[PDB]
Amino acid sequence: SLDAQEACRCIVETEILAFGYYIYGWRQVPINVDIIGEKANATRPEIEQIIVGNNKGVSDEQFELDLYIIRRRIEKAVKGEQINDFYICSLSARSIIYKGMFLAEQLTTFYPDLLDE
Amino acid sequence: CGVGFIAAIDGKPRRSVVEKGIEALKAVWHRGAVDADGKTGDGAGIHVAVPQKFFKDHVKVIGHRAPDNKLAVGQVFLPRISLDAQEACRCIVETEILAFGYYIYGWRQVPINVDIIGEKANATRPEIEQIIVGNNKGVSDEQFELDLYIIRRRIEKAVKGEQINDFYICSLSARSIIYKGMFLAEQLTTFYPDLLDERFESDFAIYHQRYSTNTFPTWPLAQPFRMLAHNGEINTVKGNVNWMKAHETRMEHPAFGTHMQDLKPVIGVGLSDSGSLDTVFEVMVRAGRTAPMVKMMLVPQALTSSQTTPDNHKALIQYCNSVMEPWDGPAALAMTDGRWVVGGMDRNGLRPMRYTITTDGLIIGGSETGMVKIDETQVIEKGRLGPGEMIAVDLQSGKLYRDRELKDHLATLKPWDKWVQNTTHLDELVKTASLKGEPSDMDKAELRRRQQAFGLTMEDMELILHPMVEDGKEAIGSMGDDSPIAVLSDKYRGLHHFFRQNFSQVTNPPIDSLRERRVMSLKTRLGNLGNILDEDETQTRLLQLESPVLTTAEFRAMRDYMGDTAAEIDATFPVDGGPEALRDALRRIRQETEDAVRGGATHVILTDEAMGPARAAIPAILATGAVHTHLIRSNLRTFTSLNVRTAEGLDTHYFAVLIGVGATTVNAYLAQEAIAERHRRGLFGSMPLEKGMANYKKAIDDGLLKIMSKMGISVISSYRGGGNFEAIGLSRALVAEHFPAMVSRISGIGLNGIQKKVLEQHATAYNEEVVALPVGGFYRFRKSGDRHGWEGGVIHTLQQAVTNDSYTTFKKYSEQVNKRPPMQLRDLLELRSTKAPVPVDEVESITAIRKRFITPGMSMGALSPEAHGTLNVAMNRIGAKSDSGEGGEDPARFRPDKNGDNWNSAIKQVASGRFGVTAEYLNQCRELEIKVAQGAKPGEGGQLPGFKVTEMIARLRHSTPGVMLISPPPHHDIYSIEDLAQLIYDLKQINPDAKVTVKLVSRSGIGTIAAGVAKANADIILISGNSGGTGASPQTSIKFAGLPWEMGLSEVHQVLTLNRLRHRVRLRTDGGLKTGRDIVIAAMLGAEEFGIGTASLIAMGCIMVRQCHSNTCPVGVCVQDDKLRQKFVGTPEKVVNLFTFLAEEVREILAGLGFRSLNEVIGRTDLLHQVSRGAEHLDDLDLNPRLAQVDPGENARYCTLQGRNEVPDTLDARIVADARPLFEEGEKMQLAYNARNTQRAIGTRLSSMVTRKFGMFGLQPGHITIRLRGTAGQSLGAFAVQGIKLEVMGDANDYVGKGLSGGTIVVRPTTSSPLETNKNTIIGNTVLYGATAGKLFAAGQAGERFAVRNSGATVVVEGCGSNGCEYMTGGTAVILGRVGDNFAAGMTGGMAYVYDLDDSLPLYINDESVIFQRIEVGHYESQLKHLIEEHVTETQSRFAAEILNDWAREVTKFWQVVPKEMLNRLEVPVHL
Ligand SMILES: Cc1cc2nc3c(=O)[nH]c(=O)nc-3n(C[C@H](O)[C@H](O)[C@H](O)COP(=O)(O)O)c2cc1C
């Protein structure tokens, strides 16, 4: 549906801006659904990325701390409204996670981003 | 699609009830959504009584002892994938039942058969089980049902606690059970073999089947519900839920006790409208009231101020409307308490409901009068349900209450008349307020300084104010809106420009308001909210106002009455506070409001009265939004009211949004001061000040009713605080935090931008030395004002490029127009490829690209005949398609000219007025088009001034010369998607070669509507935007309604691709298309065809005067004069050259990008990027929701089918196989057949063959005649031409004789029927809709809206219903009986005769535009005599026979009704 996406986006944006950080925007990850089977495709979620930058000039340490706190608060708030199939695979300034329900050898085909230089 | 209910009158269980319910369910397969699978349904269900003996024998066999009391059985849906969810839910249920003390007998697994279910309806199939609980404490049935309900609610809450998914309880009671699922209607007894048993006997049964808009079934969403079943669609649910959120915090009843606590969030999550309504209904019933009382309290009757009801019902309706907010919308309800069984209708009576009593003490009601086969010699009475009516059956005592009897029996429970007298009006309070305390007027300089602070120009006072004060009506504009959107503009646009209004496509009908204004109320009540579960005199003691808008004197009187209990709050913030002054002011006011309400205050007055040179004013919308939301979230909105004093309210769009946000009353004092100042200068003439204020208030109320009627809401109480607007260009955080329920698909400015704009305007007004207001350009261009789309340089350069026929000039034009700062959404996106360019000679030729352009519809009433013909000739010369639009077309233009120039049009429209729609008008086209809503004025009908109608137009539209013609906003044929499918079937039957196009308007939620219409066999969808032109419409509907097509097109494309439906339909867009870049962007978005419109008018000579409504256009494009039509300068070569240039531009761009065909670029969204205007504006528009790419799969990204979507064959096929001598030798024929309700549009394809062979008037009357025996389907004999005679023995369902075109239809009961032919309904609703010729004789009563938009037909019927002969235009109508209320509303041509024995016509008629007298001319007597003689001859009636017998004494019992405009034009005068 097209409400759950909008509701989750509103929740995330209200909960990030409550701390004072600056949101640069959303990005839709390029994928290729040609390699996924059927039963692994009926429950495929919409994958997106949100880019937030630190403008308060805080250290990395406090920055990671508030990012974790924001993730937990977003999880609780979304669970409040009993919205199903919502997940956060990472929210940090140090590391990223690319995961899915495909075969091992077909990881670089589903996510062409990792083929970059 | 449909509801139905069967009831045994005496009250004894029996098997026939149940099987007849099954039989009725087995015959509703024609209205459902056909599927290529044959197994996939969309929901079905039945609701019966509990078969005690079945389960008692089950328990006996199991090994227990059968108790003496009744059993209780609960049907549950448990998850199926894992084995924990089942066990966890079982543990929860068993722990929660045993906490009360009842005994559990065990679980049972229902036998099912999954062989009939489709695939997608099987991947979400839950595990169905039953739990058997018995009562051992010996409690009564009443307490037992109460604890069962409480246990159900507690189980629901506990299971939701653990976030367990796919758990549902279809029933838990000792009285009734529910069998429902996601299968087809006819396959219900195959999936559930239990119902095939011999012991399933009952005394009542309800059945329902639905028609969903999407293709993802969810089992817990199938009706009937627990103590409710609904057909239709509810309008106001975003406002009723918000008011329930305030009603919950005070309600309590001693029947529940402490347990009341787990029923506080009564309306949970994951429900539709029919679920929330059902929950509220069940809660209100389980607390003491009865089903009729709750039905009256939730869906009340229309409180009309006429003497046609006893005052008892008036007092009862006053109480009911005072205690609760109505739940509006088209609704046919069939509900059941534990004792009563009620069938009811909504306020307007849109859906149909027909019932029947048999001699076996059996009542059968439903949507169609032929569902259950019943021998004709067993009936006692047939009937219907008018607007607001209801029929009840009491099973305990076994009685049947009709409408009036039930009202009488209900109006005696409590002394309503003595209770209502507690109401206090303000009219008396302002009358008795002596004429003292007159305030001194504000100074001119102060007024101008305050007006400058908000950005009011002199054009806001000379254009949109002056007509309000003088005329009492509202301003009018006549061209599209090319103004930039609010966020991209650069001047000070008020916050009320960011909110677009709402309307209703096919799923809901808009409510017309110029004719049935009697059902729309603007009542406002202060001191109203309280406990909704009580009954006492203190509930009706409040203050009542007759309009939510108050003047200054009325405000001072109401403030007198309030006095020592109110609390005033300022709404100003210091200009020098800093970068976060507005947020702090919001915080402060929303804290003071709560701190004052808790202190005993009952009335809050939010005013910006303290605005000065150092304090800027908070935008009133934001203030009232924050305050109302906070009061709702703190459980205090139920205590107080909310009054707003604003200084910016000047237009009818301000008050709309303020009342939609949550304000109770609104006071606009600066506008009144401006009115007074303009009056003291002697500008209005000789009218007093109070007359001007009254005219202004009347115009405001009329505009408010217009805005409220675009959506389908008829009462202001249910519209307030619901917020049916939509914000475009506001941050998601701001909207989701301060406003109740609005969607912002793209974020915009936050609080900093609003603060900057406000501070800038305040500084400009209060530090700069004002002498006069700026001229301002918003509706007309002025050099000092804003920018516009079409202006002088670009128009002159386009006309030069088109006239001289040179391409480089056209590239200069495109270069000029593609260089201004951004003005629309499609200006920020950017093309970017990654391939290498290819040469220009390799791309498609101009031919195959030009055949992708069409011209939108422009009626002949607006345009001049020469321009219309020029467009039709130019568009046919290049091989493309043109459009004729509404208003019909000239028959004489139906043959190619001997210049070769073909003046015909390849696309015909079916407007909602049906002004020229005949049988030949639909067989002279290649491709049809249904118009639901227009781009400029959505949710409204086209207009045509009274002087624009000449002889040519009056003859072309079958109307009266010199008469204003306003089309009805609703459709009278399309009240829901099933009616849309029926109309599409009709159109595809009448013309066997054309396609059907649906025209929508871009807004939110259009995706589901598009996925729904695609299942109705429509093959072309058209998406218009808010930037389209028009002929004549109010300015508020032009500037503040609709959305850019960039949103709607992408939404429809994504939703259609998601449901695997994109490969069946085509997409077409128009609105604001000027260059080739725009066309390439639209093609990337998903469209395949393109409409141009306004630009074409500029190629022919139009120069954007914006005076089309004045009939004085200089060049002569849209004018009905002769002296001005002689100035036309258009020629087809101009349009041809324009299209050639526009196509070769697309060729240029495609060759430069790297492709060779438009088919390789359609849908490829990833070729578009977003760049923002820079780091100096900071508008956070994120168009990523607009650029999302849904992967198709194996299918392509466009239409890949040949021809139109195919349709089944009705009975007509056999007729065409039988009447071959008629078509080949041309001889008389005579056929006989058996009709059934599963056969639609009987006699339409035959009419098509006859029209193609001989024409409309080529056959003598009665050449081919058919005799049907049985119950006819819907649209019987639609579009029948002269020479065809249908004779039905039985009855017809609906839309009989729709668009009659000269035929003849006769309906009579069976010769062996023991019925009074003048007291039983024989035909349903909307009879003779837009007919132009023929005759129709019926031997019974008709339904509602009888003979609407009649133009030339002649009808003789023995009765009528409400809203009969509404907006009739020509012909004669004889009604030998009683009429309904609001008869002959908007009638403007023809004549009517009523046979009045009750002498009660002056109480029902709408004596506004028609006059009623008695027959005084023998010429008009011979007419009636011959009509009744023909009636008696055909139908062999007995009532009319004995009327004709006693002619001399009954001729003096007839009223003759004649329009006022037909007084100077009749052939002989009506007087002596
Ligand atoms: C003078 C005029 C008359 C129109 N008449 C109709 C009409 O009768 N029916 C209709 O559906 N649309 C009518 N339209 C709207 C067009 O069909 C189309 O939606 C609009 O012209 C597109 O705007 P555009 O030219 O800016 O692209 C009319 C528009 C104009 C300017």
Ligand code: F3S
């Ligand atoms: S604005 Fe209208 S009056 Fe004529 S010149 Fe254009 S059609």
